[PDB]
């Protein structure tokens, strides 16, 4: 869903093809990804990062997965 007011900016320091811009990549995200096993290379891969964003959006958005950190 992306009807109106999506609480998860698809920008998210991520590029649709070349993955997350690890230089402009949020430390909290970086925390998560590093836990998950996703390294810098994987973060900058097409299919990997694309599905990582879809991942984040699946739980509702950026704030949502951040809450899972303290919730699960």
């Amino acid at each position: 869903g992306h009807m109106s007011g999506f609480k998860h900016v698809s920008h998210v320091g991520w590029d649709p093809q070349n993955g997350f811009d690890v230089n402009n990549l949020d430390p909290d995200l970086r925390s998560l990804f590093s836990r998950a096993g996703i390294s810098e290379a994987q973060l900058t891969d097409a299919e990997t990062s694309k599905l990582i964003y879809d991942f984040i959006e699946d739980q509702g958005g950026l704030e949502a997965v951040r809450q899972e950190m303290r919730r699960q």
Binding site: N18, G19, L32, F33, R35, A36, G37, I38, S39, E40, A41, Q42, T44, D45, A46, E47, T48, L51, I52, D54, F55, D58, Q59, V65, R66, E68, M69, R70, R71, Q72
Partner: protein
């Protein structure tokens, strides 16, 4: 390992359930090469 106490476990499943390339090599994106 999926035995994580946070959202990070949730990620291991979501990449694995598709076919994500592991943090190693043989990935799509390539490292930038410096030219003279």
């Amino acid at each position: 390992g999926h035995m994580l106490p946070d959202v990070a476990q949730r990620l291991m499943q979501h990449l694995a359930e598709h076919g994500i390339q592991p943090a190693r090599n043989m990935a799509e994106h390539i490292p930038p090469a410096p030219n003279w």
